[PDB]
Amino acid sequence: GIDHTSKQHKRSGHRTAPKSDNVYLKLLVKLYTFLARRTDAPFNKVVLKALFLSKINRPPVSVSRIARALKQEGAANKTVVVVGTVTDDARIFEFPKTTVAALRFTAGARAKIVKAGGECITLDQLAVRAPKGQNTLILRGPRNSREAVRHFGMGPHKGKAPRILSTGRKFERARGRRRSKGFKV
Amino acid sequence: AEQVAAERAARKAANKEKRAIILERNAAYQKEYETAERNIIQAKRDAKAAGSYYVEAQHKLVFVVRIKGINKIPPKPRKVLQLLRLTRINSGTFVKVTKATLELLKLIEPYVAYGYPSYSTIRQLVYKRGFGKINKQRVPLSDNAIIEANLGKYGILSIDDLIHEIITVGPHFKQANNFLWPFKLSNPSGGWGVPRKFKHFIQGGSFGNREEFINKLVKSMN
Amino acid sequence: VLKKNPLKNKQVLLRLNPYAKVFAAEKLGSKKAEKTGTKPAAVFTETLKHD
Amino acid sequence: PSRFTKTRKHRGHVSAGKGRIGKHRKHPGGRGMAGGQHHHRINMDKYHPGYFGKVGMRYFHKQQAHFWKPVLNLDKLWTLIPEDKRDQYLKSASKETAPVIDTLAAGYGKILGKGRIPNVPVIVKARFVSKLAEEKIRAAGGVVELIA
Amino acid sequence: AISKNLPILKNHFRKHWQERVKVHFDQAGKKVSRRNARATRAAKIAPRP
Amino acid sequence: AKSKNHTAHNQTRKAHRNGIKKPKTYKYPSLKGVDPKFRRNHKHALHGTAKALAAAKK
Amino acid sequence: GKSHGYRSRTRYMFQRDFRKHGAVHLSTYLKVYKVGDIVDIKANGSIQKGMPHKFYQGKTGVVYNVTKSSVGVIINKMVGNRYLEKRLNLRVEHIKHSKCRQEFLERVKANAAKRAEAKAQGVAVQLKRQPAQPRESRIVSTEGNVPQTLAPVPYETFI
RNA sequence: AUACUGCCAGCUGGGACUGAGGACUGCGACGUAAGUCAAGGAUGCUGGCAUAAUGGUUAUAUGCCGCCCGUCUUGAAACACGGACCAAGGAGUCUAACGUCUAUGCGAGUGUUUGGGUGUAAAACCCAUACGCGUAAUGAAAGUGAACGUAGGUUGGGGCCUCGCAAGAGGUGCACAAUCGACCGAUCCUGAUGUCUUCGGAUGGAUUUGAGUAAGAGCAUAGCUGUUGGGACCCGAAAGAU
RNA sequence: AUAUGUAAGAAGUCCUUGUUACUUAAUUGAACGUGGACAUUUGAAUGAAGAGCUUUUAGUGGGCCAUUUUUGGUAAGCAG
RNA sequence: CCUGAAAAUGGAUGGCGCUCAAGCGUGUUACCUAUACUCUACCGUCAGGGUUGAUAUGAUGCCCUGACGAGUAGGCAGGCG
């Protein structure tokens, strides 16, 4: 017998081998496992694990988010890299000439980028141009702003968006939610 | 890239140089070992000559071996056995003797036998059952390169360099001792010498501090 | 593939310890020492033999 | 599908995952929302504060069409102008030929000022407008004409 | 009856609802019958629109 | 029928399975619960430092 | 029935002291507490306002708030399987500065001072504390100290 | 110059179990120079037998061990309950509305399928209405409605932007967490120009409050799991009613 | 005695304020800061098996028995 | 050691039997054997890694290394029908 200090036969807890059955995603994985093993570039390691991520863990990146990213000083000519969808933002009126590498582009997002004179490349094209991830800037979308997460941690005095169908007066705005009816949370 | 003699010659020459200094260092350790034991003997003779009593230094190293199984152990000694890396019966580790570690030993006294190992048993422990913790893996020492690749930053280059850092508790004892995987000993070849293990050694049992008699117990377990 | 224990397999012993050659050749396991008659004091034997 | 469910995997195990001691009985705690004040209080109060009681005033014969007032924010205002002429309008930013943006025709009742339109003049026809949205529209050189 | 954090639902199925359930299986059938009725009706009023 | 009334038996063991971790500490604790007079003044002092710093590194 | 009021089982805990009743000596009101100071909690039974709960007797915390007569103390309390952050509004009579904290700050200055002296010459000052070490060898002289031989005594009544 | 103790990288024997593993490498040892070796795991030689001889199966005998399963239960072999035997049948389902997660498409949008058009006819294919959800919140409501800052400051922060040849920093930092702010609604205050003098409405605020803003993330389909109503995993009342 | 709180530092330490509407008689302080001085010892020991974090959901919510402490009871294979 | 010492079917230092014991107290050894310990093989699980090499070897392929394995209620996974 052994006095075990930790749980035995414990799986890693991180993803490898993305859950997706998409062959082209798997093709990108096999390319980036090779890069993450033979290159020593930290960029290739994070791209490899980012390709395993589930859809909610790959929030969309709007071209607004990229334009702000390219406004970092020294970052104007960097290759913007996003593992996921690049979406189009109609709240901006100017887009620079940048290069964006992404898994997916929406029709407006791709049209916005090419009209400004830049490129809309995939991650296999980025690897040819940047095997070590040279001059790249990885863009991640907002992950804690989706609708599901605002119900996480719901409890007394937490302010976390009850799970509710109908919204309005007489839908959970009473006893327990105001001091004029009992108590407040 | 013809590569028949040029590359292998340099590597063998580098290996030969590492052997010469390992040989030089092992000769120095033997001289230091022999000097210390004689000097203790000479001091005892001199104190006897001048009508006085020579009190030997308190032993600086203990080897502790867990002699109890893993069932029915109260939480505090169970935590101490884990921090001493004794998670199996007959598992043994070296412990640098200090008040911080001595109080640890008194807590786990009913579950272990320990004492003061000599150079002979440490050499035999490391040679026979010596495994290094490398990448969280238990790899047999079996080669000077394996210690030099993991403890060379502390100047420990050979198996004897590792043994030296254990027998004479050195500045890098903690790194050298933790590098060693907990020793996995057998049951004693001739038995425990007592009918019942789970009394103190003083009471005719087996657990607790047997000062020098750990050498006989360990050598028969190793 | 197979662990070989020194203190047996003298070849693996010499690989780990080049000094095993010299220790063996000079017989440092059985080494004599010089003698000098340093006599303990008479008080020391009286205390030991004290009833 | 049926073959991927745990009912298939529970075959041969006595209790079907429901336990031997506390079994799968019919309605051990009541039906539906029963006992919400009594033995389900610890759930209601934790997850659904405000559930019990009444809050405000009643409105008989409330017609939802009365309050139909979808909002258009100013950052979305230029999406009402069609795409082909949009590029022309920004680059030719000028009075006396400002595009007319019929907000009601698009399907919005009120115009809100979420801010940062370009300084291109625009004529904005609306039912209701916010103070800031009209302020920002003038600063771009344009105007808000109230449409009924 | 009431359990962990979920939206409170109102599923009105406490009457004998299972007797008054209509599946529109004849969606395709009704559409064909309607086009036929339009076809025959137009013929009977052959010049009329 | 009488049952068992109360025991803390097994409760310490349960609490140690994935247990007694200390609360995570942060730089910049929340200024809630501290004196409002200090809070109101702290807001003005922090504002001036940001303006003072911005002027220096213009 | 059972009784669990605020001050239940506080008979001896909140007892004043032997020959230490009455008014509190004023040095307790002269001590200054800043945010971040480590304080001990020993409830003074004479002062009934700003009193800690009996759970917090003997607990040591950190000051986070300083008010007219009191200090907010953060105390970690074990509730189930985790520690919860508790905030105590305690009057100054029920707290005192931790002495170990003040001792460590002196070590911080002593460590910096020792580093400054050694850095002038590089003598490996080794600021790090060490456990008590096993004794070194020593020689015990017998002159004037002849060993005195002892035996077990016989049993006797002494009644 | 010795029944004790310690050490020997001292010596000489006698037994047992094991032989895992490469189409080519390592670390070493041994002679002063063809190289050998017990050095990152068994080979050499010699027999007998190519068959039920070894072995698999099965029956018995022998040695030792072996209470009847399912169930409820702290506790069952129980002097607790069901079970004489066998075959076939026999018990977590489908739907409405949903939570988490995951996959897919499109993406500030999304959903063709009420319907229309077609059709090889319940398929498939097509459709430049509306409607649902999302894109705005907040208040009981009347109502009002989200950037004067590079969409802020601070801490951390992966990744990215030089190398100097063996201590080795700085710059940029969009996920995210902590925190101080700013904006919108509500509440409580100020109440300016102006004026059907009784309306109008802050730039000024407040240990107040919101399921908010602060360069959108959603919509749809499918799947497991979990929820509610349903006969609702299957069987089972004493009753009540027409 | 046993048990128990805290601390043993990089979010730490050493300058006439840099800010404030707080505070002080007062640049007095308080809080938070810019620049300066500190990687093999980063300020006890031992260990660390990867930290930290989130969502969701099952079963369970009859317990019982050693040693030691201990209550009621003469006691109990009793009750707590 | 004996008396004190009485219960109901026949009867239990486990049984036989044991009397300088095979009893009792103690000391010293030798010896026996667990699914425990040491070492080795094989299965699985988990972890950490290697591998874009020739006119043979899909890179969830091939391979290296270490540790670990009890399980009701229950969860999940890979499979069988």
The residue fraction in helices of chain G comes out at: 10-25%
Choose one word for the global shape of chain D: elongated
Count of beta strands of chain G: 6
Number of helices of chain G: 2
Strand content of chain G: 15-25%
Report the helical percentage of chain D: 10-25%
End-to-end Cα distance of chain D, whole Å, is 55 Å
Total count of helical runs of at least 4 residues of chain D: 5
Strand percentage of chain D lies at 5-15%
The count of DSSP E runs of length 2 or more, i.e. the number of strands of chain D, is 6
- The rounded Rg of chain G comes to 26 Å
Element order of chain G: H for helix, E for strand: HEEEEEHE
Chain pair forming the biggest interface: B-C, 24 and 23 residues
Widest sheet: strand ordering of chain G:
4-3-2-1-5
Q: What Rg of chain D is obtained from the alpha carbons, in whole angstroms?
A: 29 Å
Order of helices and strands of chain D: HHEHEHEEEHE
Structural class of chain D: alpha/beta
**Assembly context of the chains:** part of a larger assembly
Shape of chain G: extended
Decide which structural class fits the backbone of chain G.
alpha+beta
Main sheet summary of chain G: 5 strands, antiparallel
Organism (chain G): Saccharomyces cerevisiae (strain ATCC 204508 / S288c)
Subcellular location (chain G): Cytoplasm
GO molecular function, one term (chain G): structural constituent of ribosome
Keywords (chain G): Cytoplasm, Isopeptide bond, Ribonucleoprotein, Ribosomal protein, Ubl conjugation
Summarize the structure.
The structure is cut from a larger assembly and holds seven protein chains of seven kinds. Chain F is an all-alpha fold and 58 residues long.
Your description of this structure?
This is part of a larger assembly, with seven protein chains of seven kinds. Chain A is of the alpha/beta class and 185 residues long. Chain A contains five helices and seven strands. Chain A has helices at 23-38, 42-50, 63-69, 107-115, 123-129, and strands at 61-62, 79-87, 99-105, 119-121, 136-138, 177-178, 181-184. In chain A, the strands form two sheets. In chain A, strands 1, 2, 3, 4 and 5 form a five-stranded parallel beta sheet that branches. Chain A has a two-stranded antiparallel ribbon with strand order 6-7. In chain A, strand 1, helix 3 (63-69) and strand 2 form a beta-alpha-beta unit. In chain A, helix 1 (23-38) runs antiparallel to helix 2. Chain A is flat, with a radius of gyration of 22 Å. Chain E is mostly helical and 49 residues long. Chain E is built from one helix and no strands. Chain F is elongated, with a radius of gyration of 25 Å. The chains are: A alpha/beta (185), B alpha+beta (222), C mainly alpha (51), D alpha/beta (148), E mainly alpha (49), F mainly alpha (58), G alpha+beta (159). At the B-G interface, helix 1, strand 1 and helix 3 of B face strand 6 of G. Strand 1 (53-55) of chain B pairs antiparallel with strand 6 of chain G. The PDB classes it as ribosome. Keywords: 80S ribosome, ribosome.
